Enzyme design. Structure first.
Site, PDB file in Angstrom:
ATOM      1  N   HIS A  33      34.865  82.806  33.680  1.00 42.18           N
ATOM      2  CA  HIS A  33      36.040  82.151  34.222  1.00 42.18           C
ATOM      3  C   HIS A  33      36.464  80.916  33.405  1.00 42.18           C
ATOM      4  O   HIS A  33      37.500  80.298  33.691  1.00 42.18           O
ATOM      5  CB  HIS A  33      35.901  81.846  35.725  1.00 42.18           C
ATOM      6  CG  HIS A  33      35.005  80.730  36.135  1.00 42.18           C
ATOM      7  ND1 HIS A  33      33.915  80.918  36.969  1.00 42.18           N
ATOM      8  CD2 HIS A  33      35.075  79.408  35.861  1.00 42.18           C
ATOM      9  CE1 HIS A  33      33.338  79.733  37.173  1.00 42.18           C
ATOM     10  NE2 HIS A  33      34.032  78.787  36.476  1.00 42.18           N
ATOM     11  N   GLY A  88      33.152  71.417  36.973  1.00 40.74           N
ATOM     12  CA  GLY A  88      32.585  71.125  35.677  1.00 40.74           C
ATOM     13  C   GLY A  88      31.103  71.538  35.593  1.00 40.74           C
ATOM     14  O   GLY A  88      30.607  71.695  34.475  1.00 40.74           O
ATOM     15  N   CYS A 142      29.843  74.479  36.419  1.00 39.56           N
ATOM     16  CA  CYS A 142      29.687  75.890  36.095  1.00 39.56           C
ATOM     17  C   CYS A 142      29.013  76.089  34.757  1.00 39.56           C
ATOM     18  O   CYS A 142      29.261  75.373  33.813  1.00 39.56           O
ATOM     19  CB  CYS A 142      31.005  76.621  36.157  1.00 39.56           C
ATOM     20  SG  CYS A 142      31.705  76.601  37.842  1.00 39.56           S
TER      21      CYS A 142
HETATM   22  C1  LIG Z   1      32.994  75.077  37.787  1.00 40.97           C
HETATM   23  S1  LIG Z   1      33.244  74.531  36.246  1.00 40.97           S
HETATM   24  N1  LIG Z   1      33.968  75.273  38.739  1.00 40.97           N
HETATM   25  C2  LIG Z   1      33.726  75.855  40.090  1.00 40.97           C
HETATM   26  C3  LIG Z   1      32.881  74.935  40.956  1.00 40.97           C
HETATM   27  C4  LIG Z   1      33.383  73.752  41.532  1.00 40.97           C
HETATM   28  C5  LIG Z   1      32.584  73.031  42.402  1.00 40.97           C
HETATM   29  C6  LIG Z   1      31.289  73.445  42.598  1.00 40.97           C
HETATM   30  N2  LIG Z   1      30.779  74.566  42.020  1.00 40.97           N
HETATM   31  C7  LIG Z   1      31.628  75.293  41.278  1.00 40.97           C
HETATM   32 NA    NA Z   2      33.024  83.658  36.002  1.00 42.45          NA
HETATM   33 NA    NA Z   3      35.602  80.742  40.194  1.00 45.70          NA
END
Ligand SMILES: *C(=S)NCc1cccnc1
Ligand code: NA
Ligand code: NA
Ligand SMILES: *C(=S)NCc1cccnc1
Ligand code: NA
Ligand code: NA
Ligand code: NA
Ligand code: NA
Ligand code: NA
Ligand code: NA
EC number: 3.4.19.12
Lengths: 305, 305
Positions: free
Chosen positions: B41, B143, B145
């Site tokens: 993503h 952030g 992820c």
């Molecule tokens: C990640 S970079 N984005 C999705 C997210 C946002 C808050 C907590 N876990 C995932």
């Molecule tokens: Na993904």
């Molecule tokens: Na997502």
């Protein structure tokens, strides 16, 4: 979202841990630059630990009686001195993994990560607080001595704690990195009284702010209080008295949440008097006092090292 | 003595984290050998995340649109493929810090450490469980992820989890390192049902053994039960049914403590029916289910990495 008891990333400290042996005692040391730091009780036998004369025991020792190993790498010891309750072993190599670091003596209520080690190898990492009564509630077995506690601020490691002992009551005592115990403890196997412990009020409040931030808000009520009135309740529940300095440190959390400190205090009061009614806050059925206001902001805003 | 929720030492994993940017999305990746792994993503804009067509979005992308950075070190991307919900970026340098590692798909109830990262830098480390319903209760902001979960067995790192999302309910979902979600989740911003969660019964029992080991013994009673009778109570309290495999995994703890598994079950029963009466076990006012029997033995016997 979520709120967890989170330790610093430990890699900067993992590369400083060594094994120190003297006679048949092995524990952990910390290799920074060309100095290895470890608990002076490495020089004690079984006999000696009821009543050790550390000056006299250490006189029996020479540089070559300190076996210091880093991985399979043996270090050569070219000097030894005792400062307070630590031993400083001068070695002939500067640790190539030495981080930027300082030594700090923290205040009761402040938090730090512990890297629990055996035989100079890391077993695990956990966050904890220096209790008001200068103990810590760790997880430490025989062989864990010399494990250190630390904070990290970007690339700077602040070493605040070296582990030395378990009291007969199952809590843990130790030193700063100049070998001065926190609290009234000494490095002998004797009955030693820890004070009455208190709850760290300002940390509890920070954690209630963390809960509101995360959506746990059931405990918020239509009441306010005063410092003096709150302090009377803190008394009775063995909570540390709250001061204006504490209010002021809570200011950025107050401003983010819109919830005045003294209103949060009135919430806490009501929890202290009524208990939690079988409810939880941030997954806990107790009031949690091992997050500082600094810790909550760091976690809630995603600060890296 | 003491018993703490303890994470693995994170240094082996800290040296694998990178930053991955594509368009204006930045998250974390894991650099092992000459491959960077990250959530697919990363290629989504704000528009795209309600209903992304990942094949079509990725076609618009070339190797040079993936900015991968390790420290200040830029990596050169020479290949890209999508496997399930992860992207694999072939780079032209093998990570010199690659540990021995494998990828494993863990089972509900198993535990692992998470190194929470932002912009490819470590913020902290914490232990948690894969819930029965395949979520995790983490601490994760925008952030985070690409943050990974792992176990360590001496020098071998088992990567089991990559973080991908926060559900509308505030719990966390993600993949194994082949990009297969745990659970029914997908990588789109939509209403998604997590199942009913259950308590991990076998982990609770392990933690009661840990308590006895540490001297917390108040909950032990003069009763026994059967599997079937215990399972009827597990039902009602939404605990995972206990099986003979679970009994058998608890065997070494049973043998160390002298307390038959089914007697420990009768203790648990009584806690479930009567609550805890405002008492604590190992500092907790809830029954804790995020230690495996393996975890308790490791901690109580001081295993290093
Ligand atoms: C990640 S970079 N984005 C999705 C997210 C946002 C808050 C907590 N876990 C995932
Ligand atoms: Na993904
Ligand atoms: Na997502
Ligand atoms: C350390 S090498 N010995 C003392 C000790 C034992 C158990 C827990 N903490 C400290
Ligand atoms: Na000592
Ligand atoms: Na503590
Ligand atoms: Na101390
Ligand atoms: Na001692
Ligand atoms: Na979890
Ligand atoms: Na998941």
């Amino acid at each position: 979202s979520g709120f967890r008891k989170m330790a610093f990333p430990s890699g900067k400290v993992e590369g400083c841990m060594v094994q120190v042996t003297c006679g048949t005692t092995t524990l952990n040391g910390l290799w920074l630059d060309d100095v290895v730091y470890c608990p002076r009780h490495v020089i004690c036998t079984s006999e000696d630990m009821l009543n050790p004369n550390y000056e006299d025991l250490l006189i029996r020792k020479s540089n070559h009686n300190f076996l210091v190993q880093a991985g399979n790498v043996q270090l050569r010891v070219i000097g030894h001195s005792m400062q307070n309750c630590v031993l400083k072993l001068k070695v002939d190599t500067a640790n190539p993994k030495t981080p930027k670091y300082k030594f700090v003596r923290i205040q009761p209520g402040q938090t730090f990560s512990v890297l629990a080690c055996y035989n100079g190898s890391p077993s695990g990492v956990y966050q904890c607080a220096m209790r008001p009564n200068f103990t810590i509630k760790g997880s430490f077995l025989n062989g864990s001595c010399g494990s250190v506690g630390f904070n990290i601020d970007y690339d700077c490691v602040s070493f605040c704690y070296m582990h030395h002992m378990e009291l007969p009551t199952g809590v843990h005592a130790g030193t700063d990195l100049e070998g001065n115990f926190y609290g009234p403890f000494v490095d002998r196997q004797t009955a030693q009284a820890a004070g009455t412990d208190t709850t760290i009020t300002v940390n509890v409040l920070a954690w209630l702010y963390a809960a509101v931030i995360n959506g746990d808000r059931w405990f918020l009520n239509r009441f306010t209080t005063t410092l003096n009135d709150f302090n009377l309740v803190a008394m009775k529940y063995n909570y540390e008295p709250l001061t204006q300095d504490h209010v002021d440190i809570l200011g950025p959390l107050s401003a983010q949440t819109g919830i005045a400190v003294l209103d949060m205090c009135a919430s806490l009061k009501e929890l202290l008097q009524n208990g939690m009614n079988g409810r939880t806050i941030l997954g806990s059925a107790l009031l949690e006092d091992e997050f500082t206001p600094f810790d909550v902001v760091r976690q809630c805003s995603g600060v890296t090292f």
